[PDB]
Structures are given as structure tokens and as C-alpha cells.
Symmetry: C2
Subunit: 275 residues, 2 copies
């Protein structure tokens, strides 16, 4: 099928998702996008809702940070095996492994990207921001054409949030970032590692909840008070698909439940219904 | 107010939990125990189901490993700040932070207990087992009167599981181990740290799913194919209560859903209904 036929068939997916959103979170601010990804082709939009609405990024901005590290490595501006001391940023909580450490430790850029992504480690993230520079990370978003994504604050910076500086994303900017990463996945060792890191995500409480342990998803979740997000790429027999779900102004428990339903509907649809 | 009265009122809680178990997992092998904990007093049973049935431990056996480390510290048989090289056991997966590391690293017994507990880190667990000795850890269980709990294999030992060697637990043995930990919580820095580690558990997908992020629970989860467990102690306005939920022969996703329902019922009951 061409793109137009896929879009037409996708209306049935929009209807199914909008139905379940209305049942479970009628007052939430819920955005999604479902796209088909093919090598060297523009993504094919299948279904969307509020796909350009700005949401709190919560941890999803970490995907951009990872991309930037691997870009610097590929362009020989850093060695991914050079180390950064744990001491280089203040300890913050909110999840991760490094918050539990007390001794003298150093981690490579690789190790930090890994922990930032697969366990949403906030200290790993802040170490990377500290060493790379927030302005430089945003400049990379501009270069990639995803600058609706913005990094304006460190992880766990409560003051910044209160003073109106928050990290932001949209469903389509994150989808475009994932498409860029998808395109790099077989290019070189750096692209491959980003893809593998995405696929080793440890939090499977949202989109892949019903899929089973055997189904790899290349993804990252985000959570803050009343914000639950999950977005990434699944490889299926009918191709790769990008699933992005952003949920704001929702009870956290309800968001997780809604995201479980939505991920099941998306996966069945692209695997069984979509030509 | 007395133990008999609490037990009688507790039959209502059994009925509510058995009802939801029948609805969601009628073919599952589900055990639970709900107890009230008071300093220096025998635990008061509130509600129980199959509380002496043996289940695969999945990661719950890690609680015993933690207790043994702190026991060795308290009796000056080890220094909790001495280090163990990451190299000391083969890399295994199945979750945690240490599996993502590649450089030369060392961790203190303290750091390894923390990682083992709060993120269920399998390499941290195997490092501790390697250095402390499996037979010694089981001898600790016998001394504590909880030797229905057994450590027979390292984490991720596929062969062992095939050769009939698995780690085992019962609801009442785990409850008695938690009572012991509870009794140590204010005794010394080691007891206090164990209590604090339990309370920094990062996996909140079972019993505390509906509770909200502000509600601390002193607990540990476990998961394997078709096994989902959660158990720990909650501090409430009406006292401390131990909640243990062991679920075997259940689809994993359904187990998480059942556990979320159960933890909500247990918490509301002890906070609102139980005198
Ligand atoms: Na969950």
C-alpha cells in the first residue's frame, strides 16, 4: 500500500485509541503518533492525536542527550570510553543506580548513556549534561530538526521547574529523533549501540505491558507527577513501527493502565490489520 | 484490639482478597499473609492464604542475603565499606545496573546490598553469594528460624533450574524474616540501613501500584517466567503491617494486575477497617 492507503486504514486505529482514551482518561491531555519506518524513506504516518502539542518531556529528553554523545564519538570529538567522575554533579534522587553509590567511582560516556537510558538514571543524565553543555545539546536538536524538544533544566531541579524552566517534547519531534536513530542503527558501531541500548530498556510498565518478555522494544519511558510517557520502535514481521504516547494531566496509575491498553492496540493493529 | 478480635475482623479481608483472586487468577497458585507488627511482640496474623506453600523465590531470597551481610557487619566479621571487584563473578543479565558496566569497578558490600535490593541487581547478588558462601547464607536462615527459605542457586543459573535446584520461599518464612528486620530497625546503624534500603525499593508495579508515590513501603519484589511476588512492611497511622503476596503459575501481566488490586485492598483494610 502507498502512504495514503495506510493513512486511510489508520483511521480505524485512531478510533480505537480515542475510544479507550475517552473511557479511561476523558480529562487527560493525551497525544500519540504511530508511524511506519523504512530505511531511507520518510516515515509514513498511520495514526495521530495531538502530535504537535508540547508536553513536559520528563525523562524522554534523555534520548536526545544519548544521540548527542554518540554524535560526538562518531565525529571524534570525544572518546566514548573516556571517564567522568561520579563527583562531577550533585547527587539527585528520582531513580537510578548511581544514587545508591557512595565511593569514588568513574564511568565512561558509554556506561553513563547506558544507565541514563535503561534505568532512567538521573545522576548519569546530569553528569552528561554537566560535561556536554545544555546549549550544545539544544544546538544538536536544532541541527537534527527536532528542536521542539528542549533541554532547559537538569534532572530533579525543582527550583527550575518552579521558575518556569522545564524540559519539553512533542510526539512528532520525538518520532523524528527516533527515525534519525533508526537510520544509524546499521551504519556503524555507535548507531548500533544506540539501537541496542534502546532495546535494553528495563521499564516495561507502559506500552509493552501486555506484549510478553520476548518482544523487544526500542524505547524510553518518562514519568513525573501526573505525566506518563513511552515512545520507541518495534520490529515486527510487517516492518518497523514507531509508537509514541505522551500522557499529561493524568493520575500516574491511570496513565500506566491506559498506556498498557494503548500499546496492545497499537501492536495488534500494525501486525494484523495494516497492509 | 486483641489478636483474636483482629483475626476475626481479618476474615473479611480474606474474603475480599479470595474474591479478587478467583476473578483474576482462578487457576493461579496464589499465597498471601497480612500481619500486624509491633515492637517486641509476636506478629499478629490478620489474613492468610496458602501461607506455608513453597514457591520459587525469584528474587525474594535477596532479603536473606542482605540480612546476612549486615549480621556479619554487626558482629565485626566484615567491614561493610570493604570492596569487592565487579570481576569476581561472571556477568549475568535479567536486570540491574552492573550488567551495563564494562570498566574496572569495585563496590562496597553496602553498595552491593543496595543495588541487589532496590533494583534487584543480579550481578550484585551473585557477587555477594560468591564472597559470602551459599552454605553460610542458608545456615543464617536456620539460625533465624526461616529456613523454609533456601538459597540453592545463583541468579540466572539456567542449568540449576533444569537440574532441580531452585531458590524457595514461603509467605510465613518471609514474614518472619521481615519481623526480624523490623526488630533491628532502631537498634543500630546496620538495622537502620536495612530498613532504609527496603524503603528505597524502586519497583512499584505490584502492591503499591495504586498507593501514590508519597507512600513509602519497605519491600522487595520478585519476578520470573509466570511468577510475580511482592512483600514488605508498610508504616500507617494505625501501626506497621506486613503484606506478602506470592503468585505462581500466573501470566506475568495478570499477576502484576492482581497484585495492584490486592495491595490496594490490603492497605485500605488495615488503615480504615481493622481496629
Ligand atoms: Na505496571
Amino acid at each position: 500500500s502507498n502512504a495514503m492507503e495506510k493513512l486511510i486504514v489508520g483511521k480505524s486505529l485512531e478510533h480505537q485509541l480515542d475510544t479507550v482514551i475517552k473511557e479511561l482518561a476523558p480529562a487527560g491531555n493525551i497525544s500519540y503518533a504511530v508511524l511506519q519506518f523504512d530505511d531511507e524513506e520518510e516515515p509514513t504516518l498511520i495514526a495521530a492525536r495531538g502530535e504537535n502539542t508540547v508536553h513536559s518531556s520528563a525523562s524522554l529528553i534523555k534520548v536526545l542527550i544519548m544521540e548527542y554523545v554518540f554524535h560526538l564519538a562518531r565525529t571524534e570529538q570525544l572518546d566514548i570510553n573516556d571517564t567522568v567522575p561520579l563527583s562531577r554533579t550533585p547527587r539527585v534522587e528520582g531513580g537510578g543506580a548511581l544514587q545508591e553509590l557512595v565511593g569514588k567511582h568513574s564511568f565512561t560516556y558509554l556506561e553513563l548513556c547506558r544507565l541514563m537510558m535503561v534505568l532512567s538514571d538521573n545522576i548519569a543524565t546530569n553528569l552528561l549534561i554537566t560535561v556536554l553543555g545544555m546549549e550544545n545539546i539544544n544546538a544538536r536538536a536544532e541541527k537534527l530538526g527536532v528542536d521542539e524538544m528542549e533541554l532547559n533544566r537538569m534532572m530533579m531541579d525543582f527550583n527550575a521547574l518552579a521558575e518556569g524552566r522545564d524540559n519539553h517534547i512533542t510526539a512528532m519531534s520525538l518520532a523524528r529523533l527516533y527515525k534519525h536513530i533508526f537510520e544509524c542503527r546499521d551504519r556503524d558501531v555507535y548507531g548500533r549501540e544506540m539501537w541496542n541500548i534502546l532495546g535494553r530498556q528495563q521499564f516495561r510498565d507502559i506500552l509493552p505491558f501486555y506484549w510478553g518478555e520476548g518482544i523487544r522494544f526500542h524505547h524510553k519511558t518518562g514519568s513525573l507527577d501526573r505525566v506518563e510517557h513511552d515512545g520507541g520502535v518495534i520490529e515486527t514481521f510487517r516492518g518497523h513501527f514507531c509508537f509514541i504516547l505522551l500522557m499529561s494531566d493524568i493520575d500516574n496509575d491511570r496513565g500506566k493502565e491506559l498506556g498498557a491498553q494503548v500499546g496492545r492496540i497499537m501492536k495488534e493493529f500494525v501486525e494484523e490489520a495494516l497492509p
